Amino acid sequence: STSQVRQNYHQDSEAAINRQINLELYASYVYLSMSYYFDRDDVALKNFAKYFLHQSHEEREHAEKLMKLQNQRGGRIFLQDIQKPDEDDWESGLNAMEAALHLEKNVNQSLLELHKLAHDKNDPHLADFIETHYLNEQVKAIKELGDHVTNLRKMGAPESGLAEYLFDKHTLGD
Amino acid sequence: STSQVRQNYHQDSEAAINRQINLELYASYVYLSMSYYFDRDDVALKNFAKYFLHQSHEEREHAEKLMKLQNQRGGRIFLQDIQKPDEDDWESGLNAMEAALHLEKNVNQSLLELHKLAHDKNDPHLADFIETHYLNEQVKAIKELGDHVTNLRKMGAPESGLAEYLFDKHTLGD
Amino acid sequence: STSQVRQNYHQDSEAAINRQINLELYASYVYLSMSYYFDRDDVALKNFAKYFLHQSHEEREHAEKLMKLQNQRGGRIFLQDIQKPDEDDWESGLNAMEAALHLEKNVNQSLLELHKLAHDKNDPHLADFIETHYLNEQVKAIKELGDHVTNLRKMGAPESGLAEYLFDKHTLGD
Amino acid sequence: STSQVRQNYHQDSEAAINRQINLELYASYVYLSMSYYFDRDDVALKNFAKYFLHQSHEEREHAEKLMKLQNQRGGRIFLQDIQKPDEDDWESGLNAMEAALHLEKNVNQSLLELHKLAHDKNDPHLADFIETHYLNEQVKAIKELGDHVTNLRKMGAPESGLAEYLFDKHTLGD
Amino acid sequence: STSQVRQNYHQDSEAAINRQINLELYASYVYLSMSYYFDRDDVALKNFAKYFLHQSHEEREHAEKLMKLQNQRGGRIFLQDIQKPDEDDWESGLNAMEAALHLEKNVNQSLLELHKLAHDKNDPHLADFIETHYLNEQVKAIKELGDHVTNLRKMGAPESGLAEYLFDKHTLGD
Amino acid sequence: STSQVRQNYHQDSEAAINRQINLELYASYVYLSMSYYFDRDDVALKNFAKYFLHQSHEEREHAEKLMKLQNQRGGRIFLQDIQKPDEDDWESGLNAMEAALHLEKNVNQSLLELHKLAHDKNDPHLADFIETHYLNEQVKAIKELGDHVTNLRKMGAPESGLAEYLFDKHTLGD
Ligand SMILES: O=C(NO)c1ccc(C(=O)NO)o1
Ligand code: NA
Ligand code: NA
Ligand SMILES: [Zn+2]
Ligand SMILES: [Zn+2]
Ligand SMILES: [Zn+2]
Ligand SMILES: [Zn+2]
Ligand SMILES: [Zn+2]
Ligand SMILES: [Zn+2]
Ligand SMILES: [Zn+2]
Ligand SMILES: [Zn+2]
Ligand SMILES: [Zn+2]
Ligand SMILES: [Zn+2]
């Protein structure tokens, strides 16, 4: 069918959207994994644990937002498997942060491509949606992972464990 | 003359804005008419009446801030007569819901054509204007009207006058 | 047909009422034009603009009120084209006020004939309706415009731009 | 490495918990899809949608509390892919209710086998865990889903389009 | 070294951003000069004075938000000397308002050029940055300075001492 | 011309004030530069940044009060180019503190010489103005910079990344 509400809504755009949803749920899955990793009795950095748990809940917010744009435009949601992440053990506070930064650069890439598509297919509505709710969020996050990584490294992580423990106290703990 | 504030504002943009002004005022007249049709002693659905008197007042807001925009950029407002609606009797609640859907998807086509003009003339201010204050509002508008229609249909409207009475109570009365 | 509520309601009154509705929308439209005219970067008298905009929203109430009385008496609303105002460029504050006084004297005329018709068709309900909700409002609005004209002319307008700028500050801006 | 906190926690229990974690995440995914299904403009039952969006967030909670449990006991979390749901179109609100029921009765069955496992490994902490935080919860949840289905049926669902609309109003909307 | 956070950030964009910073710091300097001009014992227009000083601090905000952006995107800040303003003596309130109009149109074109660049390099994050934090802020400033220049002109300035005094009180003084 | 307020205000003092104005504008630029350096994703010390950004704005205040003073005494302001800081990269937090220190003694130096000028020209208003608003402010700034440098060196700056991270937390974040 074609929904009564659909208008200037191209099907690459619609299919690009069902792709992002999955990517956002993917990242939500990664951050859950990082979170409970730093909750391990042998790692025990509670603020690393809550930092990523919060990112896990936000990625969820991202996907649900897109699931809403879809129906709003008259596209139809098709869901897919969520890949388990690439690790079971994230090694270190620094390394987990670097993986986070890598993950978000990559989600950012897809958002930019999704913007290009929306622009190329002359969807001003879809494109302002990406710029308003996603683009600058991803710059902020990526700037923030960058800063953390810079600070964990300058402090002598992940060699110095003292380093990671003070960072969990003094940066991720308000 | 050429206004002292004019900058990057193409006379084709100026004349498109004036067109949109008239179309918004037109919208408002349609809803005004729909509203006072449901206030007739033989239609007597008050929440339908309120729901359109509101959109009537909303569309008037839409025109008024196009008028501001026009002067903001140093163009010049020319008003044209306001066409009376297509109908005097709007038949039923479902139907008026189907009519407004049609109307808003139409006004939305105009906004997407105003915006593409803006893009092509390299007017980012005007394109952003359209994006923030109109596109998204139209997609929320289109999406809602669709929802009401689907519900009226599934309830058994327009035949069932029970359904329309109940939809007025449980859906448009808060 | 004939509405189950109609009573001592003559169809000339009904057609007289549809006419006034249009006329009120007309004035509503004239006052909008005046308003955004003084919002022009090359006119720029904010309080002239806010004054006429407020008159715009009141005429809209003036007309919705009449559309209410129509359905109330079981008459039936037929709308009509809203003719664009007789100017796009209202020249000055003095001249805008003078046009406005002309406009309302003319609308006052139409109401008085409507009262005459209501009286002549022995409709004391329609007659009290015009006495209560319109007649003294039209005397107040005519007197107010006259005083503004008197003051703007006594301040040496419209050749003294100083004149009109002080009037906008000291009379229309509280 | 064997965790410094592990005590009377059998590696069969550990692997049984990780299994439940995945099942709970999976249910969360099912409710998610059920939810934004009723957000489509052709379904348009907003309280069905709210009701399922909530259970999705609850099933998430279910998983998170299991991941805390694993680490509390000295086990090690291993996530796995999240299987997308069986349907992309859940047909009707009655049906989704019937599917949800089936789903919940399925997860209840897994926790009773986890419970029997715990008991047989003489793991009373893990049995008391399942007793307090899951068993009565699923039992309340199964009973409510039975109630809603029984009611949707008794009102004439899913054929009576009015029925589902009203259940969404009168039962799922407070 | 490429900054760790960089992504879709063009070296033209970065250098153009560095130019806009200088241009904003140059704006703030001009408005500073204008403000203490009116503070002179032989000009003595405190509201002109306070008007431009507020505008001076605004421009400094415009620059600092550009700088933060450079860092967010991984760009690199390079400052250059701040050109002293063109005049030491700004003649009068009218001429000062005119010169601000010229200044802000010049800033506005540089920013439209910066947006164009951003679009030419497929940097939607940058373009929507310029869109939402600068473009309509420049239109507002340009409209307001338009109105001010107009109202000063119609009053009789710069020939009428009275006019620049009363505009100081009744417009620049709230 | 000679100003109508001018009294016991020497041309050299008028000259030395104008130059002092420029030097405070310079100090504000330096501090602004140091601030956004510490905002870089590869330096990432938020409280060094806040510290220097607060300096930056205070120095602006220093200059505006000189501009105010100049007009009070009947002198005439002449603004010069504001030269860009010596550095684009400030290396480290300790080296930035040390360069702040060097700058503030240089500013102290010129302020003391401006005081000697005022004494020499028997200008006690000018002398007390300098004493009252700048002299102890300069001593306080230099004492605080001295202490910071001292602490940063004892902690092992600049070699110690940890030292600069802990100083940012425990001294500059309150
Ligand atoms: O044979 C049994 N069930 O069929 C059995 C043996 C021991 C238990 C028990 O309850 N342990 O706590 O149950
Ligand atoms: Na935009
Ligand atoms: Na009477
Ligand atoms: Zn995301
Ligand atoms: Zn993210
Ligand atoms: Zn500490
Ligand atoms: Zn509209
Ligand atoms: Zn609309
Ligand atoms: Zn384009
Ligand atoms: Zn009911
Ligand atoms: Zn009227
Ligand atoms: Zn009137
Ligand atoms: Zn006055």
Ligand SMILES: [Zn+2]
């Ligand atoms: Zn569960």
Ligand SMILES: [Zn+2]
């Ligand atoms: Zn459940």
Ligand SMILES: [Zn+2]
């Ligand atoms: Zn600016």
Ligand SMILES: [Zn+2]
């Ligand atoms: Zn500006």
Ligand SMILES: [Zn+2]
């Ligand atoms: Zn200073």
Ligand SMILES: [Zn+2]
């Ligand atoms: Zn200083």
Ligand SMILES: [Zn+2]
């Ligand atoms: Zn002495």
